[PDB]
Amino acid sequence: IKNADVAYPSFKGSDDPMKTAANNTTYNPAVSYLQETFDNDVKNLAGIDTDHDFWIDKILTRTGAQPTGKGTNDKGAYSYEGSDGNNYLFTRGRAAYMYTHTPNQLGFVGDTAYWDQTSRSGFTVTVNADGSNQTLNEDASQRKQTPSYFTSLFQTGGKSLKIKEVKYITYNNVMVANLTVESTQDRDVTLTTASPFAAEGADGATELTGRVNVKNNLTTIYPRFSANNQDGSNWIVSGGKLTSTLSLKANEPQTVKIQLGLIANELPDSTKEYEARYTGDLKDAAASYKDSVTTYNKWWVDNAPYVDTPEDNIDKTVVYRWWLSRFNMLDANMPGNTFQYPTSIEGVLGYNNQIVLTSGMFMMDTKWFRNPEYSYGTWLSAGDTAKKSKAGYYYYHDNPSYTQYITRAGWDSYKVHGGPSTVAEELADQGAEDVQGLLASKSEPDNNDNQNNNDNSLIDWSWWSMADAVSFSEPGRSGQRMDRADGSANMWANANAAAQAYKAAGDTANAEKMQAIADKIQKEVTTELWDKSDNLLKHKWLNDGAFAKYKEINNYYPYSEGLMPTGNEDYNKALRLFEDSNEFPIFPFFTANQADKAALNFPGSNNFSIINAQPLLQVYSAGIRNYDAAKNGYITNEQFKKLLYWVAFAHYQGGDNNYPDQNEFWNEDNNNVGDVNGDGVINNLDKNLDAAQNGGKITYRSWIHHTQLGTTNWTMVEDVAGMVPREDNKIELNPIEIPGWNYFTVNNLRYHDQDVSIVWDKDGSHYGGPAGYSLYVGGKLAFTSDKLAHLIYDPAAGTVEVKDDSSAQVTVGAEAVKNVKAANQVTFNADQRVTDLFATNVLE
Ligand SMILES: [Ca+2]
Ligand SMILES: [Ca+2]
Ligand SMILES: [Ca+2]
């Protein structure tokens, strides 16, 4: 059966997952929608309390101890494993978060992380009334959390005593708990708080302190711990704890505030945010809350693109994924070691490490954050942690991956944000070091670091360097090496990117040397990995030179990366396999060719993940845009659309848009079904086919939650809106038209020192502006096209070239900004954080 005719998912949950009725802001594509939203939110008292939310907090609101593993599709209820139960704590600072969390205990109970797990609670609160320490039961139906705070209601069994907790971690790692205490009777209530982080201080003091070496002694923190009563008096130290007795009048609440500053010398605002709350102007619970939540939400305005499609279920997953990219990051500014840079992390609630395979994948989205430090820091961190090879090169290496495209992803980031020659040259140099290290890696003593054991211009691996790579399951080939299409595409992509970065820097000699290396790898991929017998790109076994008979989407990375020449009839036929769900299904979105997996009686896992969806989307994108896949009917616009819908659907626990959670992976292994395909047997084909029917389901969600393992928001910016980053001053749009979508917008990209927005509004009726496909640069209309088309705009010349066979009618805006920089004309100044990554100086 064909992919073009598989069913769509059916989203469940809220009617208004983008909370459209909570945001009255009219869209003007010439300005930041999130800025205007924020302005209207503040006018409406956003941040004054937990009943007045900023829009992004409303969207990503999680209420209750929900969900619990009960979902529904169009046919009926299904059980699933791996509900998160709204038990993790979202609120976190740039370095501090809860690795584990006990939501039904006051304070911050669970494994506190400062970069990584400390095995310590942040702080606990004991409530003593009537002479007794009280059990405060959470009413979990009142549990509410957002990216910026957590709140719940705690009550004694007899309901004589209630505490509304509001807790939040500030940007610079102050862990704060507001407790609103109410008694039905006049009472003296003694609160005691204790922190494993800070227990040093004289009885009668108003602060406790400590010093804690973090995991792997990467730094030392100097925690300070204090609290105040509603009248601003401080809690007093007693026995290495803080204590206060409230004189409660019946039915009269009093609000206290506890703060633990996880203070680092290298983060001076950690001290400032703490001191403001200890004795400064943020002592009051309400002011402390409004400052933290406002600051949290300002980051979205400043960093996140705004994406709007006709499918608000996808839009909410896009907001959730900007949050995944922000939440799964470390910005600790640690001196010496690599965490001196803002870096993407592969699952802060999981393995919590920098994995080179996924680092390059994450930067496909983080490059779209408006500030370049949130992508540059990731590739600088890879360059700083690179492993010295026996041959004298430095190659990217996990800082606890069979492969990586960090240099290409870094180059993509530079094509978005730019920078001077020293930035371009640094990326090229770490890139060239890595490519050369891999080419020469036959000299690596660890066999898994040896990626070129026949010493040619192709990457080779054995299955020990790993991924669902069914190619390695070929009978008779256990432990054998093959020259890899994927490894070779990624090394080519790095080499090609390094050549481009050398050129952008002005380093002609190194640009030509890397171009020569790229040209050789490309020639060897097209000559050695092209199976002319069946017009497929295949891995090649080192021992006999035989093509690997079994296939995965990894076979197509030479297309994904643009290694393969275009306009080659034979090369373009390789993508025919994407026609068939039997070969490469849309959902579940597997890496392994499923016909191949079946031919071998199902070796490996039945798992699927965003790590499979991202490269599948990359193949679909390159396939459609460059290798004629939609013209051939191999990968149609409708199929691309269906994959976006399935990818969004997978994010939702039980298909319910209230409960987004990107697990490390999914499967249907526990999907209790019969012979659904009618082949005589109950195997994984049955579980997987059933899961794609009746609106979809995922019966197993893995134990690592709110993680990233690949990422997909780039599809909205680059395929739907069509943005093609370039080194030069020209803006290229190459949209993949989504059938039935009469509007969309990507708002407030930061691209070559310009605000950029893209609008599709078929007849202008949705946004009330120009009809058609419009680009905004610098707050002015650049151009409007009557249709979605492949357009290259030269702002310096005021020309738009129509590159496709559309008869697209384009008009250039009367006030178009002409002076759009090329990437290598962007400079950084002392007021850009990115300057501190490389250096009050400028980077020119
Ligand atoms: Ca929408
Ligand atoms: Ca090789
Ligand atoms: Ca069957």
Residue numbers in the entry: 38 to 437, 446 to 511, 516 to 888, 892 to 896
The study reports:
The GH121 β-L-arabinobiosidase HypBA2 plays a key role in the degradation system by releasing the β-Ara2 that is transferred to the specific sugar importer. HypBA2 is an exo-type glycoside hydrolase that releases a disaccharide (β-Ara2).
The crystal structure of the native (unlabeled) CΔ1049 protein was determined at 1.85 Å resolution. The second Ca2+ (Ca2) is located in the A’-region and coordinated by the side chains of Asn497, Asn499, Asn501, Asp505, and Asp532, and the main chain carbonyl of Leu503. Then, we constructed point mutants of CΔ1049 by site-directed mutagenesis. As shown in Fig 3 (right), mutations of Glu383 and Glu713 (E383A, E383Q, E713A, and E317Q) completely abolished the activity. Based on structural comparisons, we suggest that Glu713 and Asp515 are the likely catalytic nucleophile and acid/base residues of HypBA2, respectively.
